[PDB]
Automatic annotation (TrEMBL):
<protein>
    <submittedName>
        <fullName>Exopolyphosphatase</fullName>
    </submittedName>
</protein>
<dbReference type="GO" id="GO:0016462">
    <property type="term" value="F:pyrophosphatase activity"/>
</dbReference>
<dbReference type="GO" id="GO:0046872">
    <property type="term" value="F:metal ion binding"/>
</dbReference>
<feature type="domain" description="Ppx/GppA phosphatase N-terminal">
    <location>
        <begin position="24"/>
        <end position="310"/>
    </location>
</feature>
<keyword id="KW-0378">Hydrolase</keyword>
<keyword id="KW-0479">Metal-binding</keyword>
Length: 310
């Protein structure tokens, strides 16, 4: 009664092993989550194609994942790949070669598919209401999801990822370069949402949610800026809330710092390279939709994959 799902991201891949409960009430219990530091982001060439060293790291990850699942009695791993392989021009070729080498097929899912599954992961992590808007900021893309208590009704994927924006708007040496990038990213967010007014905008009673790593880091940083302990000592950030004003203040702080300093802001360790652009995406998007406050969900794509499998 054990199931395994995995996602291939940009710099990390994760295997989730869960026990599937009696179908009557159903549900799942997470047995293990195993990370692989695939680091595909540093294995992308100038045209964005995955290098042979990237194929090797990916093949190595999926081989180890397959063994972990099999030794745990979980049978076969469903594997979905997101922005890294989606945007690589040779992503489909890499996926078929990895399948030939490992027997696992990393299916490259669309941004919208990722968003609809992530919404399921959020559903089982935090309490959804009758009108929810979810923003899931990844490396290449930002997914907007709207729905009710059960599933996504509307999904939009826009090319506003933390890595993609960091690259699209290179930061200069000047003291104002962080602010200038933040402003340019915000103008790009509004421009790509311009065809889509009303779709994800706050209505009375709309509740807003965030998922994935930037948002979790933001919640950790904001809580510690209110005097809290690091999330690692407080059991994580799932369910934490923060206001748009708190996000704006964290962004203004980050923008006046240089990249190396950003990685020393508590909560933002391991995200100094993209946190400026990523916070700029989140604030600009939330502001444009009229969000006042958000809840952060540690559940996301992998949990959603489980829910669909069950
Ligand atoms: Na995303």
């Amino acid at each position: 009664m054990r199931v395994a799902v995995a996602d291939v991201g940009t710099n990390s891949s994760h295997l989730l092993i869960a026990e599937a409960l009696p179908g009557d009430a159903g549900g799942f219990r997470v047995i293990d989550t195993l990370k692989d530091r695939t680091r595909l982001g540093e294995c992308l060439d100038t045209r964005g194609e995955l290098t042979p060293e990237g194929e090797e790291r990916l093949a190595s990850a999926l081989t180890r994942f397959r063994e972990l699942a099999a030794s745990a009695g979980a049978g076969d791993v469903r594997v979905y790949a997101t922005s890294a392989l989606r945007e690589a021009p040779n992503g489909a070729e890499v996926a078929e070669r990895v399948r030939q080498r490992t027997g696992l097929y990393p299916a490259v899912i669309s941004g919208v598919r990722e968003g609809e599954l992530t919404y399921l992961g959020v559903r089982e992590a935090v309490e959804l209401g009758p009108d929810n808007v979810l923003l899931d900021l990844g490396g290449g893309s930002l997914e907007f999801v709207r729905g009710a208590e059960e599933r996504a009704a509307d999904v939009l994927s826009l090319p506003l990822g933390a890595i993609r924006m960091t690259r699209a708007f290179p930061e200069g040496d000047g003291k104002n370069a962080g602010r200038d990038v933040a402003d340019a990213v915000a103008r790009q967010v509004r421009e790509l949402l311009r065809p889509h007014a009303g779709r994800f905008a706050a209505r009375p009673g709309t509740q807003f949610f965030l998922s994935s790593g930037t948002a979790e880091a933001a919640a950790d940083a904001i809580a510690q800026r209110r005097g809290g302990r690091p999330a690692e000592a407080a059991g994580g950030v799932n369910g934490e809330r923060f206001t748009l004003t708190e996000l704006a203040d964290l962004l203004a702080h980050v923008a006046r710092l240089r990249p190396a300093q950003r990685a020393r802001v508590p909560g933002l360790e391991r995200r100094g390279d993209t946190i400026l652009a990523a916070l700029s995406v989140l604030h600009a998007a939330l502001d444009a939709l009229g969000a006042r406050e958000v809840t952060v969900s540690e559940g996301a794509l992998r949990e959603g994959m489980l829910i669909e499998e069950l």
